[PDB]
């Protein structure tokens, strides 16, 4: 009547991620009601959608880019690599969230908030260039890829979504080494028309830059990034 068992070779091992529970030692303990509580979330995707600041001019990072009164088709206002590893994104919640997973999929959202004067006017060309032929070198080449024209007026910001264009269903989150001329392409910001203004107004303005996940965005396989010290 005692039951016969066969002991597996792995007898005694401890698995840090075992899909199971252990021995309870202090049962029947009621907790302190926490039912008045608010603000709970349950999925990181629930908040990955909130835009945080992209760092410009690293390592002297500022949360914005500057538009000028000159449109050089040869000069991007910004060039971001589309990699959740860009030093550019290093401190966005998107990047901080993403660094705990192995792969991502879906839309990335670059939000621009114009912060100049109400009296200023201007147009920007924001483009996404998939990899393969290198980064575009003039607005004329960028304009050949996915892009949008942002006109300044009553409405303050512009939300640009870079479409997930990829051979694989998912893309690796982080880079092992550095990713060349690769990565997954580039977001470049250009002036189409120069910032124009009347007399009595500054001749340049700051554009706030943020990033977030699109409704499309997914992350999978939780891991740990290489440990670091903020200092």
């Amino acid at each position: 009547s005692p039951i016969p068992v066969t002991i597996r070779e792995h007898a005694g091992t401890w698995y840090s991620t075992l899909p199971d529970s252990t021995v309870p030692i202090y049962g029947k303990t009621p907790v302190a009601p926490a039912n008045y509580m608010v603000g709970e979330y349950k999925d990181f995707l629930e908040i990955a959608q909130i835009p945080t600041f992209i760092g410009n001019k690293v390592p002297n990072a500022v949360p914005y880019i500057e538009a000028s009164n000159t449109a050089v088709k040869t000069q991007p206002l910004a060039v971001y690599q589309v990699t959740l590893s860009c030093s550019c994104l290093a401190n966005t919640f998107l990047a901080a969230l993403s660094r705990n997973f192995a792969q991502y999929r879906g839309s990335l959202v670059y939000t621009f908030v114009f912060t100049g004067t109400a009296m200023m006017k201007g147009k920007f060309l924001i483009a996404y260039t998939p990899p393969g032929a290198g980064k575009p070198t003039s607005r004329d080449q960028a304009m050949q890829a996915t892009y949008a024209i942002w006109d300044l007026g009553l409405n303050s910001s512009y939300s640009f979504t870079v479409p997930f264009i990829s051979p694989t269903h998912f893309r690796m989150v982080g880079t092992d080494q550095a990713n060349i001329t690769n990565v997954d392409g580039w977001v470049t910001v250009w002036q189409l028309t120069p910032l124009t203004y009347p007399p009595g107004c500054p001749t340049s303005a700051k554009i706030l830059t943020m990033v977030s996940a699109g409704k499309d965005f997914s992350l999978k396989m939780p891991i740990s990034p290489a440990p670091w010290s903020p200092q």
Partner: protein
């Protein structure tokens, strides 16, 4: 959702033991049960009515 547990078997320890017990408090309070068990000392003869009575002062 749930965590990282994916065993088919019913938990061998019951819940009140495997987990803490989530309770909820209502804003306006709750009445203790009337009695905590049946232990008690009793007071008898507390009052009246009945004896060698009404010879007894008014």
């Amino acid at each position: 959702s749930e965590g990282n547990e994916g065993v088919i078997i019913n938990n061998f320890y019951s819940n009140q033991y495997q987990n803490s017990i989530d309770l909820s408090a209502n804003a306006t309070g709750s009445d203790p049960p009337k009695t905590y068990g049946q232990f008690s000392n009793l007071l008898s003869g507390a009052v009246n009515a009945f004896s060698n009575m009404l010879p007894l002062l008014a």
